[PDB]
């Protein structure tokens, strides 16, 4: 005795899901960045797809119009914030103009990775869900973050770490107890 | 950079799509068309009946 | 009519806006200066502690009696060097009272960074507090340590590990007679201590480049300068707070708007903040434009320019290195190599309208408050340091009328943060009293 | 009728924006500081671009690099004050020349391109 | 080991030296005699 619950499905799916092309697309991007899913790569350009389409139509209609440049400042400042558009080029041409690789880029591990705390792709992805890195207070474990200027000048370790910070962690304090063991048997 | 030929053209106007805001359509992006001095030539000598499409094919955003 | 007042001053000092601007009786004429050298080098800080009869109980600011409500000081140096002093005696100088060192015997046989729990000090202390009760004397340094000593064995009795492998000590500030401390890491934080129990109450995260420079009050509302990224932000705990205040100021407009009608610096960065009431800071920048602040907006109440002086500029010579004169000069190139000063050093004396702007510039340049709230004017110098003035304390003392004002800094040849100090002319080692009346 | 030879200086714009990108790269391990340095990353090849300062003592010692940053087609700008120039590499002392080296795996790549965009702009 | 450090200085000096009187059209000996006498001073350091 209540309403339906809110749910839609978040992503689509190309049209000719085998093809030499798509294929080979989906194994150098997936490759070079560490992922696992074409549920991964579709979603982000399923979304992509979203915010560039509603872009287009709001370019084909009529200068001047409120309706055009209220729409238009709010996608470009949904960009500006997340960072992947860039400051000057703040333009429907470039949001049009804007691709898959870059929300790739702007994906956090990869950010992990780039500033190079860990040397490997994978290395930042076990990372990550093992839990050692923070922007800030909470320390995230979806690696699917999307992070922005303000927090990407803040990506960090956590202080509560064996990492940058307390005491050793499992198996360093069980080697610690043997080696003890060792000292004292 | 598209390059459009004479059976685009052809099937452009019997289906009546403009020519830029169809490209965008299809693209999602943005797309400059581009034809080729032969093609515009293909187009001539076909000719009397085709002129309609060949003053549109010749449209000074089409570099 | 007096008594009242003086009671209703005593009262409402903790709350309010900005209430004494005792600028004009101040006989900064014959502000008498005096310049102790101390033989090691790099002295980051000293630091007073006021022993304040306070206006709700009467007792004293004592932990006993043995002090008297005589006036306390501490002196570190990067050669790791603490010594309390007594600056108590005003026609005289301070003495030189208890000494502790720090050699390379406390660094950690073990890496691991969490136990960092050595007594002593092993790398390079930066930054001291003088607990506004005298209770304990603090400390903090490049060690990533807060020490805390009992002053008067000058004994290191307990530590706080700031467990971290970058968050050096670089700034601190104490809370106007609390129990909370304030310090600020260039990790992007400003931590909220607490001594009364030895605890560590809040992490503070939100500039982009490392945090510069801090200043609060009695409440819980501190102002953070960071430097490069152009930006200050006030942290109020209670309400778990952060509003942000930026400039961005372009010396393209400013020289337009002087043909609207002189030599324009950009800010590359900024170095000190003073909240001198709770509702209006100053900001120093490194282009030598000083700005002063009102809370609401988000912009400056007023940006001033070359303030410490401009540099002046080298020479034929050792610019050049060839022979000939007028292509020596030609590669002087004229007025297209020019900078301004810095400013190092910015003492605002507490619940005031005046600071105190002094740098290796020769000369501390002070400054008041006009009481309609809206700019601040450059009145006078003092002439006595000879040497780059790091850290200004002051103390005052004598009766409510006729105050004698101490400005007591520690004063070093090197910079505050690296070395930098572009060959400076005139500057020693040690102690500045500065010494104003009325 | 000739130019002093540190041609050409900047804006006081472009030198707040190189100043930022160099601090950056203090951050993240790509730039190297030193006059030295930048000759033998020249001679590697690995040097993207060079800042140098005009106000050391005297200005000879940075001058010797305007032929390799020509002979390899590599930006080069001036700025001037080597003390700034020091501030920004995050330094004990004023330094006089720093390279940004070459990493296609950055986190700054694309400010980098921008502001040598910028710089072979205004050469 | 130590005659290369003494060395090594010495010909980061020159280095210093060479650039300068090679791009200068005509020297500074005021700074020779600097780097000179720093040569003596980091003698008689070691
Ligand atoms: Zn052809």
């Known amino acids: ?185 | 950079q598209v390059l459009i030929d004479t059976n685009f053209i052809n099937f452009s106007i019997q289906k009546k799509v403009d020519i830029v805001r169809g490209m965008m359509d299809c693209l999602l992006a943005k797309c400059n068309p581009l034809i080729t001095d032969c093609v515009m030539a293909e187009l001539e000598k076909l000719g009397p009946k085709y002129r309609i499409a060949l003053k549109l094919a010749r449209d000074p955003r089409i570099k | ?438 | ?123 | ?46």
């Open chain 3, 1 to 438: 009519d007096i008594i009242a007042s003086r009671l209703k001053e005593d009262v409402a000092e903790q709350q309010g806006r900005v209430f004494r601007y005792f600028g004009d009786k101040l006989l900064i004429s014959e502000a008498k200066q005096s310049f102790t050298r101390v033989g090691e080098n790099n002295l980051t800080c000293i630091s007073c502690f006021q022993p304040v009869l306070n206006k709700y109980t009467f007792e004293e600011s004592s932990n006993g009696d043995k002090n008297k409500g005589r006036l306390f000081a501490y002196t570190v140096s990067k050669d790791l060097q603490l010594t309390k002093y007594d600056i108590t005696d005003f026609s005289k100088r301070p003495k030189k009272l208890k000494y502790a060192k720090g050699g390379a015997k406390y660094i950690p046989t073990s890496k691991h960074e969490y136990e960092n729990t050595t007594e002593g000090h092993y790398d390079e202390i930066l930054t001291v507090a003088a607990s506004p009760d005298g209770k304990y004397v603090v400390t903090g340094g490049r060690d990533r340590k807060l020490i805390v000593w009992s002053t008067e064995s000058l004994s290191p009795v307990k530590v706080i590990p700031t467990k971290d492998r970058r968050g050096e000590v670089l700034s601190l500030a104490f809370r106007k007679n609390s129990d909370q401390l304030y310090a600020s890491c260039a990790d992007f934080k400003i931590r909220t201590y607490s001594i009364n129990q030895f605890s560590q109450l809040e992490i503070l995260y939100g500039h982009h480049d490392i945090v510069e420079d801090i200043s609060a009050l009695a409440m819980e509302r501190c102002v953070t300068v960071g430097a490069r990224d152009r930006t200050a932000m006030l942290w109020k705990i209670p309400d778990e707070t952060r509003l942000t205040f930026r400039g961005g100021d372009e010396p393209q407009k400013l020289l337009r708007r002087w043909m609207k009608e002189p030599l324009f610096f950009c800010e590359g960065s900024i170095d000190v903040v003073s909240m001198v009431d709770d509702f209006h800071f100053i900001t120093g920048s490194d282009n030598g434009n000083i700005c002063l602040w009102s809370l609401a907006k988000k912009k400056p109440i007023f940006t001033e320019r070359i303030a410490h002086g401009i540099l002046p500029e080298p020479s034929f010579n050792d610019i050049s290195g060839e022979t000939d004169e007028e292509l020596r000069k030609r590669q002087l190139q004229g007025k297209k190599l020019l900078q301004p000063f810095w400013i190092t050093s910015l003492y605002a004396i507490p619940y005031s309208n005046v600071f105190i702007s002094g740098s290796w510039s020769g000369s501390l340049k002070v400054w008041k408050i006009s009481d309609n709230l809206r700019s601040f004017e450059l009145l006078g110098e003092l002439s006595g340091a000879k040497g780059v003035v790091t850290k200004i304390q002051v103390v005052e003392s004598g009766k409510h009328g006729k105050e004698k004002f101490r400005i007591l800094a520690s004063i070093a040849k090197e910079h505050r943060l690296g070395r930098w100090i572009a060959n400076v002319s005139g500057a020693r080692n040690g102690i500045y009293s500065a010494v104003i009346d009325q």
């Open chain 5, 1 to 46: 080991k130590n005659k290369g450090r003494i060395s090594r200085y010495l010909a980061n000096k020159c280095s210093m030296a060479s650039r300068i009187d090679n791009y200068s059209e005509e020297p500074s000996n005021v700074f020779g005699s600097v780097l000179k006498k720093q040569v003596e001073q980091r003698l008689e350091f070691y």
């Open chain 4, 1 to 123: 009728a000739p130019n002093p030879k540190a041609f050409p200086l900047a804006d006081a714009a472009l030198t707040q924006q190189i100043l930022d990108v160099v601090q950056q790269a203090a951050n993240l391990r790509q730039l190297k500081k030193g006059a030295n340095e930048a000759t033998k990353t020249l001679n590697r090849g690995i040097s993207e671009f060079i800042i140098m300062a005009a106000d050391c003592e005297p200005i000879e010692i940075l001058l010797h690099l305007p032929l390799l940053c020509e002979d390899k087609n590599v930006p080069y700008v001036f700025v001037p004050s080597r003390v700034a120039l020091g501030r920004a590499c995050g330094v004990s002392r004023p330094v006089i020349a720093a390279s940004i080296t070459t990493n296609d795996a950055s986190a700054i790549k694309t400010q980098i391109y921008a502001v040598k965009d910028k710089i072979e702009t205004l050469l």
């Open chain 1, 1 to 185: 005795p209540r309403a339906p619950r809110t749910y839609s499905k978040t992503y689509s799916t190309p049209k000719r899901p085998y093809e030499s092309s798509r294929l080979d697309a989906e194994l150098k991007l997936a490759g070079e960045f560490g992922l696992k899913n074409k549920k991964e790569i579709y979603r982000i350009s399923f979304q992509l797809s979203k915010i560039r389409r509603a872009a287009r139509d709001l370019l084909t209609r009529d200068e001047k119009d409120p309706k055009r440049l209220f729409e238009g400042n709010a996608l470009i400042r949904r960009l500006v914030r997340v960072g992947v558009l860039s400051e000057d080029k703040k333009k429907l041409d470039y949001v049009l103009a804007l691709k898959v690789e870059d929300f790739l880029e702007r994906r956090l591990q990869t950010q992990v990775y780039k500033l190079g705390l860990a040397k490997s792709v994978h290395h930042a992805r076990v990372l990550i869900t093992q839990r050692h890195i923070a922007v800030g207070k909470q320390i995230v474990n979806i690696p699917s973050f999307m992070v922005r200027l303000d927090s990407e000048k803040h990506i960090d370790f956590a202080p509560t770490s064996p990492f940058g910070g307390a005491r050793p962690g499992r198996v360093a304090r069980r080697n610690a107890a043997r080696k003890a063991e060792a000292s004292g048997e």
